């Protein structure tokens, strides 16, 4: 099903078929600027993630930390910093619970949050 999930995400988005390596890691490019990495991470779950560029200056820190609470809902977007101090955003999702169209939805959220930090 991780591969059936990518089979369907590719459909709800007419794209050739997402090439994965041996760790099922794949990537998609968005508005030509954003690379979203997709990867199974456990037996039950995948990660979608991406690089978004530098920390404003400071104190978007508090604002993310103030929103880094738990949620009843899937697809929440989380932010970390890079070794080299770029925002990294990601979401982790139950692979069986997640339709191809939920995934596209997470990615849009991913790319919204980056636009806003960047």
């Amino acid at each position: 099903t991780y591969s059936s999930l990518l089979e369907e995400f590719a459909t709800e988005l007419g794209l050739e078929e997402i090439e994965t390596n041996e760790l099922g890691h794949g990537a998609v490019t968005i508005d030509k600027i954003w690379v979203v990495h997709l990867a199974p991470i456990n037996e039950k779950e995948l990660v979608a993630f991406m690089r978004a560029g530098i920390l404003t200056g400071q104190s978007q820190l508090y604002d993310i930390l103030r929103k880094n609470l738990f949620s009843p809902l899937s697809g929440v977007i989380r932010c970390a910093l890079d070794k080299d101090d770029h925002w990294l955003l990601w979401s982790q999702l139950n692979i069986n619970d997640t339709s191809g169209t939920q995934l596209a939805s997470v990615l849009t959220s991913l790319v919204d949050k980056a636009v806003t930090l960047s």
Binding site: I18, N21, H25, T29, I30
Partner: peptide, 20 residues
């Protein structure tokens, strides 16, 4: 979601975040 399929120096930045 608006655009489509590829990658470059992240099978580096990726390959790695995938353990960090």
């Amino acid at each position: 979601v608006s655009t489509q399929a590829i990658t470059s120096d992240e099978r580096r930045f990726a390959y790695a975040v995938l353990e960090h």
